[PDB]
C-alpha cells in the first residue's frame, strides 16, 4: 500500500492578556499563546503535519495571514479544511499522534478534550489520535514558561 | 496493514553527581542526568514515541512520577513494560530511529551498545534498531551543554 | 510490507561571509550557515532521516571531502538503496526567523526530487519561523526536520 508519513512543528509566546487554546480546548491559565487567531499550536502542528504526508506544502501556504477566505477562521476550521484538501489528495488519514512542550499549566486534564476535538475534525477513531505532554525541565525559552511548542506526526495512505 | 506512527521528544538538565545514563548505557562522565528516575533521556523518548503510536496516551499516565519505585527507576524496565503494553493493546513493532543532541560526551563508542539495549527491550532484531547522534553547532542551552535532548519515531502495525 | 520510520534533525550557526544554501537553493541573504560542508541544513536532515530509516547509522558515521551536501544525499540514498531499502516519501520543515523561504520552496523540493530520484508528489518541504524566541528566533541558526519513510523490498 501507498503510505506516507508527515511531520509538524509549531511554537507561540506565552504572555498575559489572550486565553490559552490547545486542541480547541480553552485551558484556565494566567497567560495565552500570541498569533493571528487563536494561536492553537497542536492544531497547527498536526495540520502541517497532514499538508506534509500529502506532499501539499503547508499550512502558510493554504491558509494565508492575508487571505479573505480564512480571516476569521479558528483552527478547528482550519484543521478541517485541511482534512479536506487531504482527501480530494486521494489521502486517507490512519493516525496522529502528537507532543505539547509546555512548563505549565497541567495538560494532562485536558488531554481526552483535545483528542475527541480532533478525532471529530479529522472524522477519525478516537483509537488513531494521542496527544502527549512534556515539560521542558526548565530549560531554555520553553523551561521559563516563555512559550508553547507542539509537535506531530501524521501517518496517511494513498486510496 | 494497519500502520501507526509515534513520536516522542525529552530533555533532562545536565549536572554534577549523577550518573550518565543513556539508551541504557552508563557512559564514564563527570555530569549526568537529572531527574526522579535514571533520568534516561533517550529511553523515554522512545518510550512517548511506542505509546504514541499506539494511542496510550504518554509515560506520565503509565509510570506515576510520585510511584516510590519511580525514584531512581530503571528506564530499561520502563522501556519493557510499555512494549509489553504496546503489545498488550494488540500491537507489534516494526522499527524505532532516534537523535541523541549534546555538545558532550562523545557518544559514538556507545551508540552501538545504546542500539542493543533498545534491540533487547523490544524483542527486535538489530536492523530495526537505530540511533543517531548530533551536537547542536553550538547553539543555545544545548549548546553550552546545559542538559542533553532525545528525540524518537516509532512504527507499528495492529496485528 | 515491511516499511520503515526514520526522524532527522540539525541546525547550524548564520555567520557572515558565507552563502546561505538550502535544499540546495542559494538564497539571497547576509549571512550563510556554517559547517565543514556547504552546511545545508534541510539536506543534512533529510539525509539523517533516510539512514535513520534503513537503520544506517548517521551522517556522521557514513561522512567526500570538498562535497556539497546534495552529492552527499545522493550517496546516501545510494547507500539506503544498497541495503535494500525503497523510499516512499520525504517531509521537513525548515525553521528560519528570516529570510523568506517561501519564493524557493518548490525549487527545494525539484532537488531533492531528483537527488533521490523520486516523483515531486512523494517530496515535501515546509517553513516556519520561530516567532522571536530562542536562537533560532534572534536569528542566530536555522533548523531543519525531517521525516522519511522507506520500504525493503
Ligand atoms: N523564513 C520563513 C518562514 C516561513 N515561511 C512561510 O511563511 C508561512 C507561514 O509560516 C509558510 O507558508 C511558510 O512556508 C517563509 O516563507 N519563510
Ligand atoms: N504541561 C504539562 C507537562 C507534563 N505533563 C505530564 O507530566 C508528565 C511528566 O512531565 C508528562 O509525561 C505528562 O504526563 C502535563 O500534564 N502537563
Ligand atoms: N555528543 C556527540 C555528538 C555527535 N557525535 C557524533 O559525531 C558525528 C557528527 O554529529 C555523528 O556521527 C555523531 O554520532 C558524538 O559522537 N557525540
Ligand atoms: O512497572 C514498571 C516499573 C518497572 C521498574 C521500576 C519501576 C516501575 C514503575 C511503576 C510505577 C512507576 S515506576
Ligand atoms: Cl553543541
Ligand atoms: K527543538
Ligand atoms: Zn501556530
Ligand atoms: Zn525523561
Ligand atoms: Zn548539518
Not at 42 to 69: E, K, Q, Y
Not at 85 to 104: K, L
Not at 135 to 157: C, D, F, H, S, W
Request: hydrophobic share 45%.
Amino acid at each position: 500500500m501507498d503510505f506516507r508519513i508527515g511531520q509538524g512543528y509549531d511554537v507561540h509566546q506565552l504572555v498575559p492578556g489572550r486565553p490559552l487554546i490547545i486542541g480547541g480546548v480553552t485551558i484556565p491559565y494566567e497567560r495565552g499563546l500570541l498569533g493571528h487567531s487563536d494561536a492553537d499550536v497542536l492544531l497547527h502542528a498536526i495540520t502541517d503535519a497532514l499538508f506534509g504526508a500529502a506532499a501539499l506544502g503547508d499550512i502558510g501556504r493554504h491558509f494565508s495571514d492575508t487571505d479573505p477566505r480564512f480571516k476569521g477562521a479558528d483552527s478547528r476550521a482550519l484543521l478541517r479544511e485541511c482534512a479536506s484538501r487531504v482527501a480530494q489528495a486521494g489521502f486517507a488519514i490512519r493516525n496522529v499522534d502528537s507532543t505539547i512542550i509546555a512548563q505549565a499549566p497541567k495538560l494532562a486534564p485536558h488531554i481526552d478534550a483535545m483528542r475527541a476535538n480532533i478525532a471529530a475534525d479529522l472524522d477519525l477513531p478516537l483509537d488513531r489520535v494521542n496527544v502527549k505532554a512534556k515539560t521542558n525541565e526548565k530549560l531554555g525559552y520553553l523551561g521559563r514558561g516563555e512559550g508553547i511548542e507542539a509537535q506531530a506526526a501524521a501517518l496517511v495512505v494513498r486510496e
